[PDB]
Write a protein that binds this DNA or RNA. Structure first.
Length: 474
DNA sequence: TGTCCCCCGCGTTTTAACCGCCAAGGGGATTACTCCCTAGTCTCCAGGCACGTGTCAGATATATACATCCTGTGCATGTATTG
């Protein structure tokens, strides 16, 4: 794709380009880590030829990942052959792999590993959908969030990654899961951790990179990788388009390929949805309120044929996520976790996750005081017969045996006596009350949650535009 | 308490003090005298002292402008370790 030049080479950012030849783009990033000996270092290499004058150069820059480091610019006055030689020689020295056949890369212990990078207007639409698309399709905000994913929360310091790089990361998490499952904290565990930290760049400052020892860190790493994938899909979706759009967002909307229609505030549907939002605000999430500003009808192509209409127990359940990634869902729908992803990160397995209490799912929006706009999606989910779970058991999926979804039994939850109906789907109104489920052996889940596995059992139905209103801070 | 060097103990080498004596004459030491300077006298008056007197230099706040002490603080730097 679009090949960017490292901006840090100020002497060449505007007069020079990264070299390419078909497949082979002479740009590469290497990472190494060995917690046994506490190495965690990167090495970027880029061949740049000037645009204006015929002159090639090799740029190298190295240091601890996150902390910018020592750089070198070697000019050649157009000696492309020597420069390419130097490039390949250094690549081999640092990797033990030849550069030209980069396709068949094999990392070796005690050497750097490679990684893979991404380097007449009649705007006819309802004004409300226009505001929605402009909100979610704001490329500036996506860039700013990506920059925050490097300098605010150091999860991806050096840059972005590819889908396949994420898949290799998942492979390493699988190896970590296998290792940890046997509770052995010796040498193999340290090497597996080395492989993880090699594939996904982290910045530990100086404190020896710690061993991944419990399930919580596994799941956190998994969520980090998921956020990486989300950013990747969001930037893939926001690709701009030409051909007389007179409002490029209309093509972006086609890319959503999902009808989203404005609803009137006085319609039964709007009022009932507001009732459901308000009645189900958990009392233990009282640091903020939420107001329903607007509500949009959802019609996603292909989902109708897939819905398990035959299955009973159909209810409308929440799903929250940050303002930016929603563009992906509306174009592709919700997906089960990556198969290559370790099962043991999900205390009750993979699949699609929903709540019936607005604030619990709403916590996954990460709205802010400065940025007070968030979205909650409502979907009709045919749960069918639920399997009842008292205590965490990541293996819930084997226990289904004919059931179609899992229920995690929370202390606080609405009782079916208050349930209402919307278009023949069950709407589980609150308030939450005690459910008389308790555990005389272990802990008790704070709140119920429902998980489905077949993607065909979800049908998105309305998208909620929500003002999160925070309060006094001191 | 520790250091180290400088002063002590001692035998040695060199020098001039000391011892014994002599000799020259400058000046100390003696004598006599004489005159002028001071003692002695007396007189006279103004310098100098006791007593008054007034003011301004200095004594007494008084407020003021530093100058000083004292403590705390933030920081460029010495060390650690890595690419």
């Amino acid at each position: 794709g679009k090949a960017p030049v490292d901006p840090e080479c100020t002497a060449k950012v505007g007069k020079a380009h990264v070299y390419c030849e078909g497949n082979d783009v002479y740009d590469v990033m290497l990472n190494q880590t060995n917690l046994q000996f506490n190495n965690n270092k990167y090495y970027l290499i880029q061949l740049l030829e000037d645009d204006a004058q015929r002159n090639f150069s090799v740029w190298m820059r190295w240091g601890r990942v996150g902390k910018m480091g020592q750089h070198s610019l070697v000019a050649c006055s157009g000696n492309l052959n020597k420069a390419k030689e130097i490039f390949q020689k250094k690549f081999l020295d640092k990797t033990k792999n030849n550069w030209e056949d980069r396709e068949k890369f094999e990392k070796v212990p005690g050497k750097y590993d490679m990684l893979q990078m991404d380097y007449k207007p009649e705007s006819q639409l309802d004004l409300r959908v226009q505001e929605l698309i402009k909100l979610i399709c704001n490329v500036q905000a996506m860039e700013e969030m990506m920059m925050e994913m490097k300098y605010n929360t150091k999860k991806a310091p050096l840059g972005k990654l590819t889908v396949a790089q994420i898949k290799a990361g998942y492979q390493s998490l699988k190896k970590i899961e296998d290792c940890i499952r046997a509770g052995q904290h010796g040498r193999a565990l340290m090497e597996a951790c080395n492989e993880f930290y090699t594939r996904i760049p982290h910045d530990f400052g100086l404190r020896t990179p710690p061993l991944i020892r419990t399930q919580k860190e596994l799941s956190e790493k998994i969520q980090l990788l998921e956020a990486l994938g989300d950013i990747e899909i969001a930037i893939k979706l926001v690709k701009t388009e030409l051909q007389s759009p007179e409002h490029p967002l209309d093509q972006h909307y086609r890319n959503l390929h999902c009808a989203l229609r404005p609803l009137d505030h006085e319609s039964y549907e709007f009022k009932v949805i507001s009732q459901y939002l308000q009645s189900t605000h958990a009392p233990t999430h009282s640091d903020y309120t939420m107001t329903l500003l607007d509500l949009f009808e959802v019609e996603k192509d292909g989902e109708k044929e897939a819905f398990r209409e035959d299955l009973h127990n159909r209810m409308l359940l929440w799903h929250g996520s940050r303002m930016s990634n929603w563009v992906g869902i509306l174009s592709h729908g919700l997906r089960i976790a990556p198969p290559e992803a370790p099962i043991t990160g999900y205390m009750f397995g993979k699949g699609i996750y929903f709540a019936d209490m607005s604030s619990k799912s709403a916590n996954y929006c990460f709205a802010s005081r400065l940025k007070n706009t968030g979205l909650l999606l409502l979907s009709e989910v045919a749960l069918g017969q639920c399997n009842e779970l008292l205590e965490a058991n990541p293996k819930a999926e084997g226990l289904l045996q004919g059931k179609h979804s899992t229920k995690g039994l929370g202390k606080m939850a609405p009782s079916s006596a208050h349930f209402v109906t919307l278009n023949g789907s069950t709407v589980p109104l609150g308030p939450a009350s005690d459910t008389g489920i308790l555990n005389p052996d272990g802990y008790t889940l704070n709140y119920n949650e429902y998980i489905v596995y077949n993607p065909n059992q979800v049908r998105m139905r309305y998208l909620l535009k929500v003002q999160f209103n925070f309060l006094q801070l001191w």
